[PDB]
Design a protein around this ligand. Structure first.
Ligand SMILES: Nc1ccc(-n2cnc(Cl)c2Cl)cc1
Ligand SMILES: Nc1ccc(-n2cnc(Cl)c2Cl)cc1
Length: 209
């Protein structure tokens, strides 16, 4: 049972800009996704200060980077607060709409794509390198869900039947054909050190077999 939703016109028109605009500095997608993971870890950590039972779904707060050359996928895993069903359909779209509109006014006023994080819509930077993004998320107050979109104006939301996650968000980037450099070990290390050096959570690179 999969529900298909239409992107808001402002968001879909931002995603088409990100996918079609010639922009070589694509490496900033990792900074934006890690920064989003850092924010999610900050939220569950703050909640645990007054309610230790919020960590019953997982005490460790970290970010894991899992490249896969065979599947041509780069996975960013965090144990943050996760996302509810209302987040994936209603709440985050409201924040995305106001942030997208402001980001696009700035893009016409000289700003470039790399400043997407200053508007709170840094997740859409994943489509600089990915032709399809699958998001597995689990919130303490909801069930595990699967978000997926190949852009094109629509996304899907469904209950995830796969491996239980406990708590957090897993972003699976199905990379484009010419973006496989972000599956290399030394390339990921250079980007993490350059852009995410001061993230207050351990970022572990899972190196392949
Ligand atoms: N509308 C809307 C829904 C989810 C997101 N989102 C942010 N981080 C991840 Cl992962 C996802 Cl999915 C963004 C916008
Ligand atoms: N709380 C909260 C979580 C994620 C986002 N977010 C990031 N990238 C996009 Cl797109 C969105 Cl929406 C915004 C707020």
């Amino acid at each position: 049972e999969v529900e298909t939703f239409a992107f808001q016109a402002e968001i879909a028109q931002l995603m088409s800009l990100i996918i079609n605009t010639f922009y070589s500095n694509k490496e900033i997608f990792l900074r934006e996704l890690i920064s989003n993971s850092s924010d999610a870890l900050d939220k569950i950590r703050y909640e645990s200060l007054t309610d230790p039972s919020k960590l019953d779904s997982g005490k460790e707060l970290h970010i894991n980077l899992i490249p896969n050359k065979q599947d041509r996928t780069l996975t960013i895993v965090d144990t943050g607060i996760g996302m509810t069903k209302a987040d994936l359909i209603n709440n985050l779209g409201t924040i995305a709409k106001s942030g997208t509109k402001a980001f696009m006014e700035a893009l016409q006023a000289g700003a470039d794509i790399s400043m997407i994080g200053q508007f709170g819509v840094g997740f859409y930077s994943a489509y600089l390198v990915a032709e399809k993004v699958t998001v597995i998320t689990k919130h303490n107050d909801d069930e595990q869900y699967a978000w997926e979109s190949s852009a094109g104006g629509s996304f899907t939301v469904r209950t995830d039947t796969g491996e239980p996650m406990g708590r957090g968000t897993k972003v699976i980037l199905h990379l484009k054909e010419d973006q496989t450099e972000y599956l290399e070990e030394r390339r990921i290390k250079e980007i993490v050190k350059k852009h995410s050096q001061f993230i207050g959570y351990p970022i572990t690179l899972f190196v392949e077999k």
